[PDB]
Design a protein around this ligand. Structure first.
Ligand code: FMN
Ligand code: 7NE
Ligand code: ORO
Length: 361
């Protein structure tokens, strides 16, 4: 409840009526590298503690993948009140991505469509940007216990999918609290291979040497699915996940099956925000049922209010990543939504958050 937030959250709602997305985004990215973005320091409520396997998130709210792709402000994004951030996605060979502009935001429908094309400075340049932080992380107080994952994918023209990840782990795997595979860009057996492929490198890091991360342990393997699949395709996947014994999924990414949005009729790419919430709260409640409550799930897909966030948990999401929230509601988005959830896990008579995971039977 600062003047600082509120002041920025005028500047920004201005941006969201007059400036391009990317431009606003790349501007506000810049400040936070020069550390002029307001902090959220006030201690969280332990009752909204949460974890996946052995991965402890001081609060449930992170910044989703593709927000800080190049990991250039990790600092001042986590010091807005997010437990964790997800950086990348990052390809072994860094890309300028599709031609601009490629990020378009709806202000009424609070929705975003992008054809970015995985623009990143490349696994090499990024790893160095993360390391420089893991250093900063020991010195600075306000980054103790804050989890950084890394999203990884394949180059556009890839020699082999697996070997593009393989380079990526090898480079960065030491400094991530989790690795995020994504197969969700705008069969099951080829997936199984990848997963196994990915665990193997992470199992090779441990043998050929260490963990300069926040856990100081080997990074968990999460896959980031997309909501545009059939039951058949889905259940065929779920089995792989249990077969791969996988550390967790990140339901979901950007849908492409939304054409009710006027401003976006002339655009191509995947949509994130309000119109993708519902779709993604049903995509947790299916991939929960099939894996039979055995795989931990990180929600992403139209989370804005503490209610929006609770709907994901009670579906089965042990954690919440925000992206569109920040675009629309702003820098208070952590402080506001966190306040909102505590006042809602109460209302509902949840003793703690972890009690409320998957309480849709
Ligand atoms: C402009 C833009 C870039 C994105 N880049 C990535 C990315 O590199 N890797 C990734 O895994 N997800 C990426 N996403 C997807 C988000 O991480 C998130 O899953 C999606 O936006 C849903 O969040 P929301 O509906 O809560 O905004 C991107 C989304 C947008 C709008
Ligand atoms: C590309 C995502 O959407 C934007 O461009 C956009 C945007 N994104 C960001 C990016 C980084 C941020 C860092 C800190 C606080 C808010 C932020 C908000 O804030 C206003 C706006 O228009
Ligand atoms: O960079 C992109 O095009 C991109 C990557 C991703 O994972 N999700 C998305 O919506 N866009």
């Amino acid at each position: 409840y600062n003047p600082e937030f509120f002041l920025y959250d005028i500047f920004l709602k201005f941006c969201l009526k007059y400036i391009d997305g990317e431009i606003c985004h790349d501007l506000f990215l810049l400040l936070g590298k020069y550390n002029i973005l307001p902090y959220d320091t006030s201690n969280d409520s332990i009752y909204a503690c949460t974890n996946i396997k052995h991965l402890d998130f001081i609060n449930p709210f992170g910044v989703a993948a593709g927000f800080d792709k190049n990991g250039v402000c990790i600092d001042s994004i986590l010091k807005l009140g997010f437990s964790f951030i997800e950086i990348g996605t990052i390809t072994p060979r860094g890309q300028t991505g599709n031609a601009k502009p490629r990020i378009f935001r709806d202000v009424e429908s609070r929705s975003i469509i992008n054809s970015c094309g995985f623009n990143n400075m490349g696994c090499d340049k990024v790893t160095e940007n993360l390391i420089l932080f893991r250093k900063r992380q020991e010195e600075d107080k306000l980054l103790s216990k804050h989890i950084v994952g890394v999203s990884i994918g394949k180059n556009k023209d890839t020699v082999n999918i697996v070997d593009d990840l393989k380079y990526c782990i090898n480079k960065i795997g030491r400094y991530a609290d989790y690795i995020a595979i994504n197969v969700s860009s705008p069969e099951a057996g080829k997936l199984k291979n990848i997963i196994l492929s990915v665990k193997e490198e992470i199992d090779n890091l441990e043998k050929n040497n260490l963990w300069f991360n926040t856990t100081k342990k080997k990074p968990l393997v999460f896959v980031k699915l997309a909501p545009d699949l059939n039951q058949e395709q889905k259940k065929e996947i779920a089995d792989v996940l249990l077969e791969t014994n996988i550390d967790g999924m990140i339901i979901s990414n950007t849908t492409t099956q939304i054409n009710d949005i006027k401003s976006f009729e002339n655009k191509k790419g995947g949509v994130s925000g309000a119109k993708l919430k519902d779709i993604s709260t049903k995509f947790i409640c299916e991939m929960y049922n099939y894996t039979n409550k055995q795989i931990p799930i990180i929600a992403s897909g139209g989370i804005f209010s503490g209610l929006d966030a609770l709907e994901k948990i009670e579906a089965g999401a042990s954690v919440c990543q925000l992206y569109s929230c920040l675009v629309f509601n702003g820098m208070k988005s952590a402080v506001q939504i966190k306040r909102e959830l505590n006042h809602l896990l109460y209302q509902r008579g949840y003793y703690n958050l972890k009690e409320a995971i998957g309480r849709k039977h």
